[PDB]
Amino acid sequence: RKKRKFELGRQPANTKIGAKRIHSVRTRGGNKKYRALRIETGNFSWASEGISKKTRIAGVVYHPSNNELVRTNTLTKAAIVQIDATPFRQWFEAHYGQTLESSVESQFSAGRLYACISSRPGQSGRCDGYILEGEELAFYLRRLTAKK
Amino acid sequence: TVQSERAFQKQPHIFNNPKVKTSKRTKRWYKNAGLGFKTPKTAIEGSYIDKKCPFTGLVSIRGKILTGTVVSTKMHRTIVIRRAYLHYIPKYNRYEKRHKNVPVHVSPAFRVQVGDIVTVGQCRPISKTVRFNVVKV
Amino acid sequence: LKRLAAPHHWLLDKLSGCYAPRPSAGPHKLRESLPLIVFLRNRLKYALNGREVKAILMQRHVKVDGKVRTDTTYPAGFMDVITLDATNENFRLVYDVKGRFAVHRITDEEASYKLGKVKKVQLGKKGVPYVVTHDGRTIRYPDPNIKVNDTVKIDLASGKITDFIKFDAGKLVYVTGGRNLGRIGTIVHKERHDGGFDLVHIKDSLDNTFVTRLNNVFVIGEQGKPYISLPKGKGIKLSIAEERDRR
Amino acid sequence: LVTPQRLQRKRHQRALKVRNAQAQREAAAEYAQLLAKRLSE
Amino acid sequence: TYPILIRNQALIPQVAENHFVDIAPFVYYKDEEDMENERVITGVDRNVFLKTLSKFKNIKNVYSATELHDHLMVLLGSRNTDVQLDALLAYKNPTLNKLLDDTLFKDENGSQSIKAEDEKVVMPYVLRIFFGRAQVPPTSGQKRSRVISVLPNFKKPYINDRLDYNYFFKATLKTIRRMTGFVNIVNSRTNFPLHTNSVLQPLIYSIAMASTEEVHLRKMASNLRQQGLKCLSSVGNTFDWSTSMEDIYAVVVKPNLQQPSSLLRLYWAHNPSLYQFATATALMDQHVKEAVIGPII
RNA sequence: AUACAGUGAAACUGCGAAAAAUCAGUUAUCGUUUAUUUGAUAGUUCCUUUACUACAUGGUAUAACUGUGGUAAUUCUAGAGCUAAUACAUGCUUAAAAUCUCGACCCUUUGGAAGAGAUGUAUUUAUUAGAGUCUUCGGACUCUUUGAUGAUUCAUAAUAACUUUUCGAAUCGCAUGGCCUUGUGCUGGCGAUGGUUCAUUCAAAUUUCUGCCCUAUCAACUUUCGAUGGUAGGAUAGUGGCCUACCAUGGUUUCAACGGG
Numbered sequence A: 001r002k003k004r005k006f007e008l009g010r011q012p013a014n015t016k017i018g019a020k021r022i023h024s025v026r027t028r029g030g031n032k033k034y035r036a037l038r039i040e041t042g043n044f045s046w047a048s049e050g051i052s053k054k055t056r057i058a059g060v061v062y063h064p065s066n067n068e069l070v071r072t073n074t075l076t077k078a079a080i081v082q083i084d085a086t087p088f089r090q091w092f093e094a095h096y097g098q099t100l101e102s103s104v105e106s107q108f109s110a111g112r113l114y115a116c117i118s119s120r121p122g123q124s125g126r127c128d129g130y131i132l133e134g135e136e137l138a139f140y141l142r143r144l145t146a147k148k
Numbered sequence B: 001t002v003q004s005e006r007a008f009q010k011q012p013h014i015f016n017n018p019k020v021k022t023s024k025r026t027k028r029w030y031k032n033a034g035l036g037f038k039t040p041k042t043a044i045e046g047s048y049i050d051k052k053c054p055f056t057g058l059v060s061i062r063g064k065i066l067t068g069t070v071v072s073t074k075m076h077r078t079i080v081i082r083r084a085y086l087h088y089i090p091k092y093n094r095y096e097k098r099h100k101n102v103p104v105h106v107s108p109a110f111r112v113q114v115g116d117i118v119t120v121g122q123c124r125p126i127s128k129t130v131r132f133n134v135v136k137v
Numbered sequence C: 001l002k003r004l005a006a007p008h009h010w011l012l013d014k015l016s017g018c019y020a021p022r023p024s025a026g027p028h029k030l031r032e033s034l035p036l037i038v039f040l041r042n043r044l045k046y047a048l049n050g051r052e053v054k055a056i057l058m059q060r061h062v063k064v065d066g067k068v069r070t071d072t073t074y075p076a077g078f079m080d081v082i083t084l085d086a087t088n089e090n091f092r093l094v095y096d097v098k099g100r101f102a103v104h105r106i107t108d109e110e111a112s113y114k115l116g117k118v119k120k121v122q123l124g125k126k127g128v129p130y131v132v133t134h135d136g137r138t139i140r141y142p143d144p145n146i147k148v149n150d151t152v153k154i155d156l157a158s159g160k161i162t163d164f165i166k167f168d169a170g171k172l173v174y175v176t177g178g179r180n181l182g183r184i185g186t187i188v189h190k191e192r193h194d195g196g197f198d199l200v201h202i203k204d205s206l207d208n209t210f211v212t213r214l215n216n217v218f219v220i221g222e223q224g225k226p227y228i229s230l231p232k233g234k235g236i237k238l239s240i241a242e243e244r245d246r247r
Numbered sequence D: 001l002v003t004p005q006r007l008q009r010k011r012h013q014r015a016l017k018v019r020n021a022q023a024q025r026e027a028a029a030e031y032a033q034l035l036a037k038r039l040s041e
Numbered sequence E: 001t002y003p004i005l006i007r008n009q010a011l012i013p014q015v016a017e018n019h020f021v022d023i024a025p026f027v028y029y030k031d032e033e034d035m036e037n038e039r040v041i042t043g044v045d046r047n048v049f050l051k052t053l054s055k056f057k058n059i060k061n062v063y064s065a066t067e068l069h070d071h072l073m074v075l076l077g078s079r080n081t082d083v084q085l086d087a088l089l090a091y092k093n094p095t096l097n098k099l100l101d102d103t104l105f106k107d108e109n110g111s112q113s114i115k116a117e118d119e120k121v122v123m124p125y126v127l128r129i130f131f132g133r134a135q136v137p138p139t140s141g142q143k144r145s146r147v148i149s150v151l152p153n154f155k156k157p158y159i160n161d162r163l164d165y166n167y168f169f170k171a172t173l174k175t176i177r178r179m180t181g182f183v184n185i186v187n188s189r190t191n192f193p194l195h196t197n198s199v200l201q202p203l204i205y206s207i208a209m210a211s212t213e214e215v216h217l218r219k220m221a222s223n224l225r226q227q228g229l230k231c232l233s234s235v236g237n238t239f240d241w242s243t244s245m246e247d248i249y250a251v252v253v254k255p256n257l258q259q260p261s262s263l264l265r266l267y268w269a270h271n272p273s274l275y276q277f278a279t280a281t282a283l284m285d286q287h288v289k290e291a292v293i294g295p296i297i
Numbered sequence F: 001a002u003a004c005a006g007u008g009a010a011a012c013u014g015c016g017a018a019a020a021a022u023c024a025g026u027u028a029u030c031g032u033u034u035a036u037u038u039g040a041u042a043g044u045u046c047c048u049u050u051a052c053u054a055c056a057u058g059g060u061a062u063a064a065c066u067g068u069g070g071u072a073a074u075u076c077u078a079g080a081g082c083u084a085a086u087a088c089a090u091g092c093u094u095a096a097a098a099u100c101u102c103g104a105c106c107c108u109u110u111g112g113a114a115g116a117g118a119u120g121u122a123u124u125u126a127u128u129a130g131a132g133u134c135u136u137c138g139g140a141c142u143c144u145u146u147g148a149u150g151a152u153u154c155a156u157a158a159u160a161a162c163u164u165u166u167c168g169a170a171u172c173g174c175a176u177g178g179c180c181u182u183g184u185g186c187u188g189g190c191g192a193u194g195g196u197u198c199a200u201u202c203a204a205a206u207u208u209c210u211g212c213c214c215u216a217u218c219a220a221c222u223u224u225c226g227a228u229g230g231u232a233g234g235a236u237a238g239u240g241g242c243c244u245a246c247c248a249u250g251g252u253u254u255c256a257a258c259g260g261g
Helices: A086-096 A102-108 A135-147 B041-045 C036-042 C050-058 C240-246 D004-040 E002-010 E013-027 E030-041 E046-060 E070-083 E086-097 E100-105 E109-121 E132-145 E150-160 E163-168 E171-185 E191-209 E212-233 E237-249 E258-263 E270-274 E279-284 E287-296
Strands: A021-025 A033-037 A041-046 A052-056 A059-062 A080-082 A115-117 A128-131 B065-072 B078-083 B100-105 B117-122 B132-136 C081-084 C089-095 C101-103 C114-117 C121-123 C129-131 C151-154 C161-165 C172-175 C217-221
Touching: A041 E100, A052 A086, A052 E100, A059 A135, A086 E132, A102 A135, B065 B100, C036 C050, C114 C217, C151 C217, C161 C217, E002 E013, E002 E030, E013 E030, E013 E046, E030 E070, E046 E070, E046 E109, E070 E086, E070 E109, E086 E100, E086 E109, E100 E132, E109 E132, E109 E150, E132 E150, E150 E171, E150 E191, E163 E191, E171 E191, E171 E212, E191 E212, E191 E237, E212 E258, E258 E279, E258 E287, E279 E287
Parallel strands: A041 A128, B100 B132
Antiparallel strands: A021 A033, A041 A052, A059 A080, A080 A115, A115 A128, B065 B078, B065 B117, B078 B100, B117 B132, C081 C089, C089 C101, C114 C151, C121 C129, C151 C161, C172 C217
């Protein structure tokens, strides 16, 4: 158990969207990990009201460390993705009675929201994101202006 | 100025709710470092991020507490400390002089002056060579 | 099978082959326990050689603190009892004035229980408070006035607690480990640093104010009324030169 | 094959689980009364 | 029987035997024989029309003998895809009978068979079971995300569970139907579903006032869910025709139901309650009475 | 002994064969694994169940074996058919559940209770919590609700989901006992293995600092192909440029860095 070597690495998972595949990988000392390869779905959660749903991810539109990952549509941690917005819209209509915040009510009728990945599906085994709302929504709208 | 990177400066698992309101914008987390080290109000109400702060970040100080003096601040968010301890080997029969150098992680909640005396604590590894952490000047 | 430099308070013979027994995993550490091979082979001499010790272990004659533990390299370390059903014997193994494992012949009504210092009090699962002790008996539902570095009195029929000695300034104490081994008495000073190197200081018949590490000390009971018996005049280490001067 | 032994073993397993749960939920109530008297003092 | 079904799988005269078997399958060892006969029959005209309805029942549910076998659902979906856009719906329903990505993709006969196979393969898989909670939440999410779908779901609930005496005024099947009604009202055709749920709650009340703990827990959960359904809906004719005998039996007991009596009394709700009236007894007979008094006043 | 029973070839299975450079110590793991031993550890798998159900317990897929050969040798082989499980792969666990509140009412309580309500673990997130009198003179009258650490975003509980899935015993040797509804009926012991999580144990892993020869006719070394830091990510049992991007241009040193034996 747990020897040491000098200098090497391994090949990344660098997962995509479409044809979700999960490959298990051997971990020394419990917690047998899972590399997600080309995963197309994810668990996405509202921050304020606190409701998750599994949702088809549409695509990552921003990455803060490599712009080429947005071109290749790579799902790492801390990215900006679009998903569906419809089950969160369904819960919103069902349990608030509004049947529609300002800058997310403007995103509802646009159709797709923005969220942040918090798992590491290259190593963990699943993808989760929470829908950005508040000052995170402010700086990421400024990051949309940094896009345009 | 706070934001200085392509990524948003995140302090995870602690976030405000927009429907509730306070004059803090995030339930800002702070901790006392221990061994009598006391957090300052400038470090508390400073809205700096510092994910490697030993009062508000993720790291916790423990064990060794050394002293030293600042020799340079010519690195981005890391400082270098000197220790010119008095030294004696019996081959010399005299109080000879050496010096010991180390890099120490630094926080944006504290002024830095080349020459003043800093009290430094031991923490987890932070860089390739930075292992310690500033806790108090 | 690495050996021939054992913990030298075991006092095995050096012209006894080459090796020395490896204590397996168990309730105590490596160099502060004493396996039953070293016990029954060169400490009281009931069996000559180690396979005969394996025979008397396999034939269910020996039980450490309640159950049998049919194992040669079983590190039955400090403060437990060994109820040899034949020979009517209750070996409690405690410490001495010099650093060895002194033996007793305990009565049955005292061998029915054992005690030990706790190491932590925690909340385990589903909000259940459980304490540990030094020999790994992580037992649930204490009285929640149990503090760290305190002693409970395990019932040894069940694993329940019958009583505890809430240590503070001034209740009778034992020591274990370090160069001030085997001493008693708890009342001079109570030092508390931040990071160890502290003791409840000791007072004896000669009132020797002594200290060690707080990890190297644990409690017994009230002054003059101890819960455990102690071997050979309740070990003091006055002086051997003064002993040969008086008697 | 269903010999008389195997269902006896299954019966003993089921009664073992129920009896362990019974003793545990007795000890929880005992600690509850102990915390009650520690409150009262 | 198993040998003969194996011979029929090893098989005009086969279609005439299939017509006789269509009679026997419209009527009703039997589980393995039904599996073998379904695997044979998935590989006439009016017997085909009746067998399409029987296979739609077997791909919408496995209600009587078993409870939602996945092999039975696969055999019934293969028979329905052999009987009757269509290719894409068939591939999505086949991946659903194989559930997460299929529900994410499928989030009008194809819609009927889709609600059929979805509530079949997640037809109350268990209580918790470390996956049945997620499966029941997935079925509720699909039923809320797919009005014809909810109408067909209430239609299947009523098809599980005469009606004239059940609207005017089998214990184990009634307990299973009460669990079905609790599971149906567990979701986040309204008049027929309310009539069937009121009939189930009234029959549970009668058989409980006459297994008894099963009927008690099912009637309690069904009454709490009925109060929740009336509070989430908020017609007074069938409302009075349901509430009359229930509150009459709960006349002395009311000294769930009290929260319904306090939620159906706060303008048009006040008219709906004064259509019945008792209320002073509900006020006088504690925070559970204090909130009702200091709201109803 | 018409399932076998103690004996045991062979084989399957289970386990174990893992010249500040080295180190001698020291510090932490509130920065990881925690196999083996030891101690506590878990009622929840079907209820669109009466045209009522695999659990008195369901399925393959093969060794050894039998048979056909090759071959020049044997720790070489190909084909075929059998037959097992703590191997492999599924899988339901019978007052359908069961337990604690509230217990109004009675009858006097140490109750017995009609009905108002709740109930696993694991994985990955996002939160939240986690900080002066009356006095039968006897006592009471409401009191200020939380574990530990020097230190937590710790331990843990709940919340809303996702689980390609986790576990929640399809196992084994000895005795055969108590009951009465005499039925292959209900229950029952000693303890071998396996499994969830926590603690302990040893074992591994880094990491802290104190310490070794001769040198300046040895003073500059390193950013190339990250040399020195930050930020985010990949990874990894794991911190950490260990690597990938963008930013900054550093760091070591004459007290002998760097090189020479």
